Symmetry: D2
Subunit: 483 residues, 4 copies
């Protein structure tokens, strides 16, 4: 019923609190204490000091063991974490159990393992006097990492940033989304119980503008800011940290495409586009909101998708056979519904959905919408260019390989793309021409945590994952010995 | 007498021009045509288009071979490049012959080779269905790289950015310092004569605010901005590209320290600090302006360094035995002299220098100052904390190793540091505790081009050099094949 | 014409000599002096002393520049090298001009570049006393490398070993095949004229047993033995160096398969198999001598291949549209023909060829055979299991993917395989299951010099190419500093 | 007690057994069943078959998880492993507790982690038709690994080979020293209880010639032979596998030097050399048996070492304050004593030791010798050049740096060297000149498991540890896709 901040080893309240609302039924889950500027400073100062403490003296093997203990602590409370994620967001219990929570445990274990095996470089060189010199690099913590995370995959994305930060020996001040504060608070309890030293991990609650989020980005004591969320928010943050020339790592919006070629396994493609459009009710940065299907199979694709989409069970997270929960909030539902209207006004054909389901129970006070498919829009329509972040896709026919490549690339975004084809040459030839961070062939959101992850253009800045995270969360320093 | 812009394969003039003045004698060298917003736009569009032309079709081996040809063409005009860099900046001819021009040639060769040898990653994974998946990464050009370079090592820093940009298959719009435009204009001729396709390399002349530099940073058509220069300028550029979320790479100011331990080779450390403080008349980001010397050798060090500083020949670039030329400009001299006055005001002892030499010839119309040594200032003094960028160092005693490490690190900058000690443990123990991008032990500015190069805190953002350059100037894309 | 040994900077003759015979017409090309044991010792001692000369003092940059001069020297005498390869082996002039000689040049250039860019490792560790330690590795020359090469790709395979050896700072004693000693002798001239210091590169001529090859392998002065050739010879050499526990690197025989799946591009597959079976008259270790074609397209494949094999031009190296020259020698032809008879005895159907062409000119005194195709042999037949090393292939149908994988792997060899398929999944799924060093999909013998190259089982020992050559030809040494 | 073989998941007896003798007192510990040729074959065939079973189907994550369970199993029986190691070897309990057993556990954990994190390479290339090609590598099990280990660090060295072998997906047939079979037998129990599939790990007991060791090396079913032990045995083994061209990896003898410069911390160097000479009663391949001390400190060094050596407590493994236990066996003691006499015969001064201690108890029936120090021998003396493998060192003075470097390098061996100096330049300058696999500066036998580990010359063949192990125990295969 109440969620506290976690600062310098202590759970602490605040002068103000805000409502945490279950989107299944509009009911109050808890009140959340909002950290103010003083508390943010206190968090950052504590993190700075923690760097000079026992955390700073741990060997890499011991730090890694301790991180493995955080992962163990989450596993030990697995079902509590599931319930926490579910309550905040309305996501299906099965998704929380298979995707959200196990990925958070894996995030810690993977970066603990990387931290342990990573090494640096030795460069030998000749000099004028014939004695030579040695250059070697070492890996130091960057310092205090400020973490700001979104609500689509709360624990997953939170720990995606927090785990490599800690693995590289940094200290952390982390601000989860106001819409999904619960699993982050549980994680803070796991950290405390695991004996993570005071000040190493700090959790602050609040909003962005004129709240904890902004105060973090403005604090001169942080060394870097890592952020996942809206593109325009990324621009704001970059401006905020600019005077301290802080390092930044961004994963921002997309308007991602799926492309189905005539030679695709059609049933697999229909199935694939279904999950890529409607997973988490379409509320993943990685979702496909534009779909291009070859003309010769377009009608059969749209027909098959319509059928599968209409079979999707929209209901309670714990309901048998449920496929979709609600949107995160009423405010977000208002945005999505305003796009549903905008699509009609723009001339779209509503193949399916386009409204909100009727339950005749508590769920009518929730924030549900229906899975929606449009056709008939131009490539320039706002509904096909702007990110909606709802369970929706527009499907469009295409004819030629180069044509569709140009159409996928005709965007200010470039996060990810999914391609369906059985042809060897086409798969590799087309993939390399798509201007995004991630291309999937005959699948979607399939993740190896070692790979580079991120987007080009407005979709991001930098890369994370594997060695790219080890690079960002570390200060690589060069030492030259004249011999 | 005239320096043109180079846009889309053609040398073009402009409506306005500005003076290029020789700092040795205050005389006019050339008129430089200033690119306006329209010309900057034309350069960017031409760069965008060149990406889809012949340049985009070259194999990695053919691109590398052409970049080697650029290097060859500089080499074939070696003495012209020397005379250009000298005329603009007043640097001694011997420095231009040994440092500036050869490093510019070596920059191209190094990144050409790196481009031929670099590869990417293959990740194998298991899937639920037991068929598995492949993730592989590919290296693509990022796009159009905006380059803005400073006047301290004009061609070296210009090519430091341009070489890896081209080696990675990018196209370039580059704006060199208004104080040192000549060698860059010469490079454009080499580019043209070598057969670099139109639009691949574009040179725009001008200033920062309300001029070519600002127009470049604000153009939506660039994919990245790499910049070396003032720290506050870095902040301005970060703000300016934030709306487009552009990749940025910064090498900024420094207030670098040298530390001389009791067990140093004293005569070598004196000579070392002389070189680190007064090379290029102290106008390098890497120069030492703070010097800490063990108490037991402090008086001897200061006396030794005074004698050597007064031996330095300050004069014409090709004068016999010359060690120091003038500062870059009268405006920069006004800044430096302003700090010379501030130091006396803050209670400094002037061990030597402190003013301007009197030549009683045309050099009196140039921008010379004396090499200057201060003692007696507090660690809080402005002259000890703010980057001056002239031929000066303050020398302070220390007693204790941990004390001196704290005093070195007590700075909003962290670019480089030089340490003098003959003790094995001390060299490695102390070095790793210095919070800077580069440490030298028993030398200074010894460069291996494969090392990471950059600074921490206000001194930089990101790293370049070796694979760090190959990452920044590349778009690293992940492709996932479900099998 | 005469071919001398090259020892300690000098061309020298020997007590004994043998004939170099043109396989096109059986005429004498030159006399070759056979090095005795005394001269082999002299070469090895010279190479040992060369490690302590000026060669050992060169910077990696300077050594790389010199290697680039060797490559320049071959390029400057390109057609002389083409002429020499062709004379010894009868290979088409077009193959020599496009494959053989350019690869030899690219071998030197690639490893010189690799030597310039390559670095080693830095490992930090904690210690009980809390002060830590550093482990760093350095790359040293291994010492004297013994090189023994075969006659199939004479200069290519010779420089494939010699180039990385020199690039890693080693010295070399090299014994080319008695059947192809010309191009290597010319290479010795290039080395001498490029100013390669005396003893760095030594060339000895002769045979295996009781001759230069054996003497080299028995000499205690070498640090490693690298070898390409027959599998049994590999075993003999391994025994010979065992008393000195010398490092060895072997690329040995193969009985390589090609697999054509039903979804293949049939015309391309036919042309591909033609190439992989008959290139260099089937005298490449990488050639396919067993072919598996899906039952549904088997007859059509065999018909198509027969027609193409019959259009092949067998004749003079510079003859218009020539596809195949002779075999290396009459003795080799004796072996290949004996297998032609054996195949008939084992009950093979001779689809085409199976004899020797009748020229009615000087070529009838050469060592030509016809390109040959067989069907109807069981998987256990000697001709399907033993390496023939001539222009021949057996074709057999298959039904099942798992079945054909098993049949390809049912072999004591494991060098290479080519598979033909347009299916994305199939290419990757099948390729990873083939127990060979190298798989090609929809091509054959397409080389990127950075990749690992070698065979499993009886087909080799170790890998070369890229970092694997850099590792084999270097002493990687670990240095640990306790801090 | 009895020690059985472990073949295809079953503990089995043999036709013959041999005695396992406690070297502290000469009493019988157990009878050990000696595997015959038939049982060796059964073990190899079972290892082959296990590759095609459930073991072959584990994901890299699952295989790693299971290898961690093996480590967990050892940890759970920690004191039993200690007792087994101690009983077989007479090693001090505190050594087994801190070095031997924890390293066996760490071997498994380190390679499990490396297997989880390791990835391979992607190479892009251009082709004539302008479509390009992809080369990528994959990591496969080599096959069946034959492991032969020595008695000096039984479980440590046994798991040093077995852990990476299993981590890379191989199956194992492993033969421990007849002198120390107990801990390896306990390990098979741990494997069994952890649910390692039958045939994945096989333990065969026995001798070398005409026994399990020989039979394993000559078996055509193994893919590789990894071996630590005597040099001459390495030669024997290299010959035995030659007919199969098996991959081999050797860590062989040494005659290692320590060098103490005048500027060393003398006290630390005396303690360091005491540890390097007498650890495990001088029975480690890495022990120093030759010591060079600068003449200015020679007498003080030798006097101090004499004092510390005489303070060494030689006795029972669980004796209070024990430093040294017995040698491994009476047979080994006879060898070491023959060297003690030989030293006297070539004119040595015995500074201390030189015989066997008189205990007047059951230990007199064991295999004890005294820690021994010689001076007065020339560099050509057999006792200064041949590996003794007992608790002994000769100390010689030196004058010049280049002199002592030549004397260290004047050896058919080159495993390791330790150097004592406080001078920064000297440390790096001298270290890189010692022709061995491992140099320690101001320490000895400090191990980072990521570093390359092995010797040059007669001391080894190949490298293990880190990526070097990952390379040797893996088949790295290239796949080339033409696009
Ligand atoms: O899977 C990840 O590591 C990740 O960061 C996903 C981002 C999705 C945001 O909506
Ligand atoms: O040496 C370099 O590569 C470099 O970038 C030097 C920067 C110095 C700025 O004053
Ligand atoms: O292409 C290569 O580098 C190579 O080694 C070719 C081997 C062919 C042997 O017949
Ligand atoms: O510490 C190791 O990994 C190792 O292999 C030690 C070898 C010592 C043999 O006597
Ligand atoms: Na909520
Ligand atoms: Na100027
Ligand atoms: Na010949
Ligand atoms: Na025993």
């Amino acid at each position: 019923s109440q969620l506290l901040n976690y600062i310098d080893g202590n759970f602490v309240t605040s002068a103000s609190s805000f409502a945490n609302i279950n989107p299944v039924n509009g009911k109050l889950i808890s009140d959340v204490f909002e950290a103010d500027a003083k508390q943010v400073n206190e968090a950052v100062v504590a993190a700075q000091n923690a760097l000079k403490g026992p955390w700073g003296k741990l060997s890499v093997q011991d730090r890694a063991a301790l991180i493995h203990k955080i992962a163990d602590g989450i596993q030990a409370r697995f079902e509590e974490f599931v319930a926490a994620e579910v309550a905040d967001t309305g996501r299906p219990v099965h998704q929380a159990r298979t995707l959200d929570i196990p990925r958070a445990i894996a995030n810690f274990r993977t970066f603990a393992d990387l931290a342990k095996t990573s090494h640096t470089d030795l460069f030998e060189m000749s000099t004028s006097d014939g004695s030579g010199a040695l250059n070697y690099t070492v890996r130091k913590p960057l310092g205090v990492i400020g973490v700001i995370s979104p609500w689509d995959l709360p624990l997953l994305l939170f720990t995606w940033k927090v785990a490599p930060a800690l693995a590289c020996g940094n200290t952390v001040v982390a601000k989860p989304s106001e819409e999904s504060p619960s699993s982050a608070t549980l994680l803070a309890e796991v950290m405390h119980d695991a004996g993570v030293p005071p000040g190493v991990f700090n959790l602050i609650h609040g909003f962005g503008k004129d709240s904890a989020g902004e105060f973090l980005t403005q604090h001169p004591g942080i060394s870097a800011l890592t952020f996942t969320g809206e593109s325009k928010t990324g621009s704001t943050i970059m401006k905020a940290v600019a005077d301290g020339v802080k390092e930044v790592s961004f994963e921002l919006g997309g308007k991602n495409a799926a492309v189905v070629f005539a030679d695709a396994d059609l049933d697999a493609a229909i199935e694939g586009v279904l999950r890529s459009s409607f997973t988490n009710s379409g509320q993943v940065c990685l979702c496909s909101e534009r779909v291009y299907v070859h003309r010769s199979i377009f009608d059969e694709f749209v027909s098959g998708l319509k059928v599968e989409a209409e079979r999707l069970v929209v209901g309670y997270p714990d309901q048998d056979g449920v496929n979709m929960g609600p949107l995160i909030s009423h405010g977000h539902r208002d945005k999505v519904l305003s796009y549903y209207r905008l699509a009609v006004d723009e001339g779209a054909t509503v193949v399916t959905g386009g409204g909100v389901p009727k339950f005749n129970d508590e769920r009518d006070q929730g924030a549900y919408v229906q899975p929606t498919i449009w056709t008939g829009l131009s490539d320039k329509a706002r509904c096909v260019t702007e990110e909606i972040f709802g369970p929706v896709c527009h499907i469009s026919p295409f004819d030629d390989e180069d044509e569709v490549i140009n159409r996928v690339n005709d965007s200010n975004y470039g996060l990810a793309c999914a391609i369906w084809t059985t042809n060897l040459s086409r798969a590799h030839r087309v993939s390399r021409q798509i201007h995004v961070g991630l291309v999937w062939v005959n699948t979607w959101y399939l993740r190896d945590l070692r790979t580079p992850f991120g987007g080009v253009k407005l979709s991001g800045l930098g890369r994370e994952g594997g060695r790219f995270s080890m690079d960002f969360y570390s200060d690589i320093a060069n030492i030259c010995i004249k011999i």
